[PDB]
DNA sequence: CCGCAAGGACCGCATACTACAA
């Protein structure tokens, strides 16, 4: 029941609530927000994969995405960048149209990068 | 009747050399 009360079934303590709120606070305080929101956004920078895809298939994908659900599209973009992966859509007929489209693009411009790097440095 | 009575080249090369979902 606690899980159902929270977004993404993810219960939060007071400190992590602050953590989730903090980006919108900085947004209102500075007008600024980090350009790459999730690790997937960073991952898809690999060989400009997302940029190449969006130019070639970006418009069509967002159209089919909203056809499945309006909650998948925000500001003419996918609500989550993991929707560039076919497996995300798999885990009904409108969904199959997306996966076939994604797989077609992969054979053309390559599979999307699924790995990213964490860099920590210290003197 | 007698004698001789193998030698080097090549020497595994290339391709494929994870894909994908659950």
UniProtKB/Swiss-Prot annotation:
Superkingdom to which the source organism belongs: Archaea
Record: residues binding Mn(2+) 3: 122
Subcellular location per the Swiss-Prot or TrEMBL entry: Cytoplasm
Record annotation: effect of changing residue 122 to N: No effect on pre-crRNA cleavage
Binding site for Zn(2+): 13, 16
Subunit structure as annotated in this protein's UniProt entry: Part of the type III-B Cmr ribonucleoprotein (RNP) complex, an elongated RNP with Cmr2 and Cmr3 as the base, with Cmr4 and Cmr5 forming a helical core along the mature crRNA (39 or 45 nt in length), while the complex is capped by Cmr6 and Cmr1. The 5' end of the crRNA is bound to Cmr2 and Cmr3, while Cmr6 and a Cmr1 subunit (Cmr1-1 or Cmr1-2) cap the 3' end of the crRNA.
Functional note: CRISPR (clustered regularly interspaced short palindromic repeat), is an adaptive immune system that provides protection against mobile genetic elements (viruses, transposable elements and conjugative plasmids). CRISPR clusters contain sequences complementary to antecedent mobile elements and target invading nucleic acids. CRISPR clusters are transcribed and processed into CRISPR RNA (crRNA), formerly called psiRNA (prokaryotic silencing) in this organism.
Family: Belongs to the CRISPR system Cmr2 family.
This protein's name: CRISPR system Cmr subunit Cmr2
Species whose genome carries this gene: Pyrococcus furiosus (strain ATCC 43587 / DSM 3638 / JCM 8422 / Vc1)
Residues of the full protein shown: 466 to 601 of 871
